[PDB]
């Protein structure tokens, strides 16, 4: 169940680890174009807040959600900002959304007095005053509903298949971040010279097994000269003293 294009539902996700590898294995996922960052480097950025919009659009107007574009359904119901950050995920769904008897569960607006700002959830069922004189009450001459409904049939080919599209836009370092991707954990070498990056500690020196008694939240190890001489290895409670050979 997804919301309509104009009545799009926004779900906010924060304070977790965002893994895109378990999401990239989707079968009908073909539409993918990211602008802010390279898609391969999505796992090494920390995000203040993440919200997603889910809505169903026709097969012909799939790319109308792309930033900087205009159209009948992309100018009156939902649109992306020109400086759109991130990228959307779209996949064809002609086995569930499409109905044999015709799917009429969504509405699209084609009539409007003016345009709407991108990232707007404001919509109404106000009639379109097409005629010069004011139109109120019931429909008369030049008085029509600004919105029209989908007409989805399985006999339709490309250009009419419904697409389930999720839009992943987010802020970039506007606050203490909440969502970060998975971080690289490249093995561990002991009793041998190695460069290390243990949670932001940079240096050189062989890593040896040590048995000092730390405390529940004691990570670093500081010596007399105020230099690191012990580190608590991430993903483990092990403590290793850093000394040359």
């Amino acid at each position, epitope marked *: 169940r997804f919301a309509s294009v104009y009545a799009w539902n926004r779900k906010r996700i924060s304070n977790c680890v965002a893994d895109y590898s378990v999401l990239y294995n989707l079968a009908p996922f073909f539409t993918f174009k990211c602008y802010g960052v390279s898609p391969t480097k999505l796992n090494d950025l920390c995000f203040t807040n993440v919200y997603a919009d889910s809505f169903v659009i026709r097969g012909d107007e799939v790319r109308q959600i792309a930033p900087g574009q205009t159209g009948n359904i992309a100018d009156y119901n939902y649109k992306l900002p020109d400086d759109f950050t991130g990228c959307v995920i779209a996949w064809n769904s002609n086995k569930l959304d499409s109905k044999v008897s015709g799917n009429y569960n969504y509405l699209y607006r*084609l*009539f409007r007095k003016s345009n709407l700002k991108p990232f707007e959830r404001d919509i109404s069922t106000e009639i379109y005053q*097409a*005629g*010069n*004189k004011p139109c109120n009450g019931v429909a*008369g*001459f*030049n008085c*029509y*509903f600004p919105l*029209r409904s989908y007409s989805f049939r399985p006999t339709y080919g490309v250009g009419h298949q419904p697409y389930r599209v999720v839009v992943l836009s987010f802020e970039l370092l506007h606050a203490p971040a909440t969502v970060c991707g998975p971080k690289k954990s490249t093995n561990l070498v002991k009793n041998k010279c190695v460069n290390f990056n243990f949670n932001g500690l940079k240096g050189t020196g062989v890593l040896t097994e040590s048995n000092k008694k730390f405390l529940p939240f004691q990570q670093f190890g500081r010596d007399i000269a105020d230099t690191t001489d012990a580190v608590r290895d991430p993903q483990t409670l092990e403590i290793l003293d850093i000394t040359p050979c």
Partner: antibody
Amino acid sequence: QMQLVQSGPEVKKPGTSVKVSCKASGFTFTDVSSLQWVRQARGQRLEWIGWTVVGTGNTNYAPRFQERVTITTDKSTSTAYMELSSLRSEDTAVYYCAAPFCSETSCSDGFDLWGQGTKVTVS
Amino acid sequence: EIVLTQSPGTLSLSPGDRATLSCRASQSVRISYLAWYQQKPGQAPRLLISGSSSRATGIPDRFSASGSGTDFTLTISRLEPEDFAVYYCQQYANSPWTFGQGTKVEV
């Protein structure tokens, strides 16, 4: 120029199906403009066959015009295919398709354009 | 299902004279959805006044629409030689139009 083109007079027989097409040069059916059809006899009172909207798909017809007459709107060609069935001897008249110039900008509360129609006679 | 009454049915006036017509509808009263049309004998019809408040392109200044009640009045400044056609007044808000007999002006 703002003109409407249509086929010439036609002669037919009862018990058949008639398809009438009229195009507009310099005018388009767009999304807001809605056209209508009238039948004009030999100096007799007009009758409203029906009006349809190309975009919204609104269908309205006269009470006696809901079983033998149909209007199908084509946006790509901006035309109104008029389908008539079980035609009788009273259909010998001139059919007109009329639409106002209302294309996403402005329009009045009346019908502006008027084609020459088709002089259709059924024996 | 609309009954339209137009008066006068026939006009016998000298050419170039001012003319007045009135009409009424048996359906619900609408003040902004009345239009006046003229159809030539054997030629395509042309609109005269749309909405009873303004004219269209090419409409002469003679045609003027007025009326506060159900009756709608159309005034013509002078009996222009090529304006001698048949008049019709039509509503828009009510049921599908049942066009009246038609008021035709002639010498």
